[PDB]
Amino acid sequence: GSSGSSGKAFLEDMKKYAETFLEPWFKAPNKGTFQIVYKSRNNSHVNREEVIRELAGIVCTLNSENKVDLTNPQYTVVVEIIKAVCCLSVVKSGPSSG
């Protein structure tokens, strides 16, 4: 995974948060699949891939059982950009047996 080196605070923070925030959503005893999506209404300096990829790289770190999927995702983690802030929205969708 990511070598692990500070630098882009904008991200560093999002990590410490998305982690302790998604812990109960990705980190045991919770686990499962998910789908990350980068949403930005305005032009942002930080790349979208870096945000998505990374976010995913952290999810797995929590629980090895966690596996980001784009087909049968259980938890949708979207990242909206507002007032220059990382807005993480977790949506629980399960079309299985309603």
UniProtKB/Swiss-Prot annotation:
THUMP domain: residues covered: 8-92
Stated name of the protein: THUMP domain-containing protein 1
Quaternary organization: Interacts with NAT10. Binds tRNA.
Family that this chain belongs to: Belongs to the THUMPD1 family.
Domain of life: Eukaryota
Signal sequence, start to end: none
Function noted in UniProt: Functions as a tRNA-binding adapter to mediate NAT10-dependent tRNA acetylation modifying cytidine to N4-acetylcytidine (ac4C).
Disease listed for this protein: Neurodevelopmental disorder with speech delay and variable ocular anomalies: An autosomal recessive disorder characterized by global developmental delay, speech delay, moderate to severe intellectual deficiency, behavioral abnormalities such as angry outbursts, facial dysmorphism, and ophthalmological abnormalities. Brain imaging is usually normal, but abnormalities of the corpus callosum have been reported.
Taxonomic source organism: Homo sapiens
